[PDB]
């Protein structure tokens, strides 16, 4: 599964 | 969202028309570029499952992506129903998704003591489905991002890290990719400059060194 | 909407000019594409029958559709008058539709104990009429949605599920359609790829397999 | 509008700049298409006669229509002065129109016990004058609305019911018109299809039957 | 006199 | 009668 | 505007950026068409002299008109100083114009008991200067408004009453003008139709009779 | 002096 | 701005994004036309020195003008430090300019008893620097404003008074200029008309007399 | 931001959709021109680390710059962890960056007594990374800014001080640059005029002297 | 020094 | 390290 797109912070 | 009434009751505030129009514009224009997910998450702060469903239902285009999102939400709801066997009542996965729960039940859970944050749980399942959609709508593999013979290294870096953000590999794999591919796929001038910095170079050092090429 | 006054009275809040302009834009531009109904439902959160009538009256175009909507609202009101024989007073169907009730009666019912939610009842009759309009304004049968010889399977899936959303068959029929027609109406390359996945394939699996075709 | 002050006094709230700009845009662009009157009525919710006068005075174009509106308001005010002979003081027709009353008198009446709702009375006289203007600005008789040899029946129905809305005959006459003219003025194909449905057909049945013609 | 343009509600 | 257009939630 | 603080003090509320931008757009675009004065009066509801000065100072164009406005305000202030000899202190004309008064003095007067409404007094002097400007910026005499050989009588009536509104003669003179010139300056067909109605005809009767010409 | 432009109300 | 908290504390309210965007648009588009200074003064009502600095820092263009503004603010701060020798603490010029003061000190001064209004003092120094910039950015001397052979006297008056506003001479000099140059620099027809009015003529009389030329 | 609830609790207020859209527009259009940093700082007044992360995550373009920003934030967080050894709990650098802290912990720190202002600390690390990005995205060295043979000295000064602002040398170096390069790089006419003023000339004196060249 | 641009009010 | 872009105020 993908790790997500939130470069900054806690996802 | 949820608001405290002047009578002290927990009360629904409707997601505003301008917030909905902002979301609709975002999905219509940006077509699951990765910044769609942070923008969704920002526009749905404190959202009930009814508010989240309102956002998802108001999307008119991309109905294949919305079906993949629905399928993800359904398997996440089924996984919740597996992990939380049935005995305020406890919400089922369909209650968290807002299909079998009223707005009043949703607010009842979200303002319980301790709260059962069905809006945040459901928003996790939505974001987890948008992750899959953003990965699928990525137009290129990171292996396909190569620098043109006269392309600025900054434009290549922008393309590389936008692709890396959409493809959303694990951080160890992103580390290997930024260490290895970003140098390997640079054009021969930049590739020559970048190898001279050694393996420890930061992106700011790399972009500075290549800034004149 | 309804708001509590500082004196503690139940008080009308007018639907804002920007909310009306948003609705008017939505109906004018999107011309009963299915996302019009979620957008109506979002723009009319907590609406009294007077607010709902204001939204419907402010639509200037599509007057044939608005007449079909009026006819639906009238037969739903007549069905209410049938199901609820006459003995706060109890609202008749024309009171719920806001034709024979004052705004003050509407607020009286919507804030009664227990409330008689004439705004939500009427909004159900409106949405039930918009369903018929969206189905009629659907430009194609789902049987007419076929993939072009060089069309991306994602664009075909978008067309298919947008048509399936507008045609709004029962879920068992939508299941049969997405199982059978979506494969059957794919172009010969995609149709070949999709049959190899077997009947259990999810839409994300189908779209992944066809992503390079 | 009127608002309760924190000191408990009845206080004027000015009609907002965006509400005025919305009204000015509506009158300038839509040029007394019938949806102008619902939009006026929505933008003037809870309006004092001063607010209503502000809306009417801010219209820069259409000064012949605004003179017909003024003439209507004057004969309605004269009719009020006839029906209500002079003995808070009781408002004269010129007081309801806000020509001889202060804003403070208007709020005094609108918040009396029982209220004398001079804003709603005046808004009735305005809407009653806009009715005449919308009827006059209707570009066609309903008898002139005929279907083109290749025109979609839905576009003809839209034209027919928009004209019927502007011409605003009595409901018995609208019933006769939709029964008789809508069939009679359809093109020969649609006219043939529609006669086969018999006289009891609903508009949705008619539009469905003609949907392929 | 015209009946008014309010298709829905109480005119 | 049509089932409605609400892909998500309770219709 | 003025607002009551939570501490109960009389407090200034600044005229909002959107209200100022609306005024600036109005003066820039509409160039002293008569609807500028109602729009000024609506945008300056409850304005202090400082707020009114802010509106007038933010106008960048039309500096000859703004000098005529300043000259009018100065002669109105001088007339006030004549009519109100000097003995909270009583405001001089320069205090009402906000040149020699602080915002705190302005609020002190506007919230006195009884109030001295220096904002409304000054707004009268402004509107009285805008009247002169609108009359001067009127592009045509009412005697110059004549109907074209193929011009619709409705467009001629719009031109006539817009000119009559800008020229702003006394009501007895406007009555004579609408009785006499509006018929006299109609084209020969309309002029023939209109004379047949007799002198008592209303504008709606005139516009109806000429509607087909 | 001009009578003003307020067609409706108290000028 | 400053706001009273519900706990009764003096609290900062941030200058809104729309107010900043309005200021940025104003400086970018109007390029120190004189109406920039009233618009600055209106957008910065009740501003702390931090808010004023935010407005000045957000200007991206015109960096030579912003350096002249900084130089003016520095010499005004130095003049304050000269006029107010150092002994809540008393603010130095750098504290009023918000360079050596915290937002909490600024609010402490602005809400003291009596207040030390460091926001208004600093706003005076800003406006005093913008005066110099507007004078320098004036494209023409008032002596260069001459009427074209076929130019309307109203357009010449607009040019003359806009230039006179930007050049911002003393009022006695503006009086001499409007008495002498405005006639002297009119074209020969207007100059002939204007001399016939004698030296006492008002601008409205001059513009009326020349209105047909 | 943070807001006090009506129950007296410290409560999150979400960064508004219009504030996010303003930030996204700013970064997309202005592409790290120096005014991006004041605009960031203004749009993030009172922001929690979650709000700051929302702003940074919603940027879709410039992903190389956002990676340099992330790298800066990480080395600032590591420096905090170095300067503040671990023993409300004390925040680590990852807590201040909002990666290992909840919104509730962030509000707990920001409203502690004394507050630990993790939003302002993190905003310093963000601005410190944007400084590096603005310096790198500067298209020219200050040594490359030279006046064209017919270029206005004001346009050259604008280019010079915009470049000087982006390059952001120390103030002693900016002093040397504005003393030496600004004269040295002027075209021969302006360079001749400027040397005649002597070394003490202010920018307003320089721009005045060159205003006719 | 310039007198300022405020045509109306107290400058 | 760069001094920052805040021409006015406390940076």
TrEMBL record, chains B, C, D, G, I, J:
Gene Ontology process terms (BP): viral translational frameshifting
UniProt keyword list: ATP-binding, Capsid protein, Host cell membrane, Host cytoplasm, Host endosome, Host membrane, Host nucleus, Host-virus interaction, Lipoprotein, Membrane, Metal-binding, Myristate, Nucleotide-binding, Phosphoprotein, Repeat, RNA-binding, Viral nucleoprotein, Viral release from host cell, Virion, Zinc, Zinc-finger
Top-level taxon of the source organism: Viruses
GO cellular component: host cell nucleus; host cell plasma membrane; host multivesicular body; viral nucleocapsid; virion membrane
Keyword Protein transport: no
Main location: host cell
Binding site for ATP: 18
Membrane topology qualifier: Lipid-anchor
MF-aspect GO terms: ATP binding; RNA binding; structural molecule activity; zinc ion binding
Disulfide-bond pairs as recorded: 190-210
Protein name, UniProt field: Gag polyprotein
Gene that encodes the chain: gag
Portion held of the full protein: 133 to 353 of 403
């Amino acid at each position: 599964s993908p790790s997500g797109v939130f470069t900054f912070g806690a996802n | 969202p949820i608001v405290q009434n002047l009578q002290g009751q927990m009360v629904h505030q409707a997601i505003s028309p301008r917030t909905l129009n902002a979301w609709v514009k975002v999905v219509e224009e940006k077509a699951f570029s990765p910044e769609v997910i942070p923008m969704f998450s920002a526009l749905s702060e404190g959202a009930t499952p009814q508010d989240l469903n309102t956002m998802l239902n108001t999307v008119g285009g991309h109905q294949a992506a919305m079906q993949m999102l629905k399928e993800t939400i359904n398997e996440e709801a089924a996984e919740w129903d597996r992990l939380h066997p049935v005995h305020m009542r406890e919400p089922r996965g369909s209650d968290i998704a807002g299909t079998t729960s009223t707005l009043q039940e949703q607010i009842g859970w979200m303002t319980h003591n301790p709260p059962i944050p069905v809006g945040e749980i459901y928003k996790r399942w939505i974001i987890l489905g948008l992750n899959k959609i953003v990965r699928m709508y990525s137009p290129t593999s990171i292996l396909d991002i190569r620098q043109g013979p006269k392309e600025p290294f900054r434009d290549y870096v922008d393309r590389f890290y936008k692709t890396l953000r959409a493809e959303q590999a694990s951080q160890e794999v992103k580390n290997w990719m930024t260490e290895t591919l970003l140098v390997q796929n640079a054009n021969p001038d930049c590739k020559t400059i970048l190898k001279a910095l050694g393996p420890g170079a930061t992106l700011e050092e790399m972009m500075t060194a290549c800034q004149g090429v």
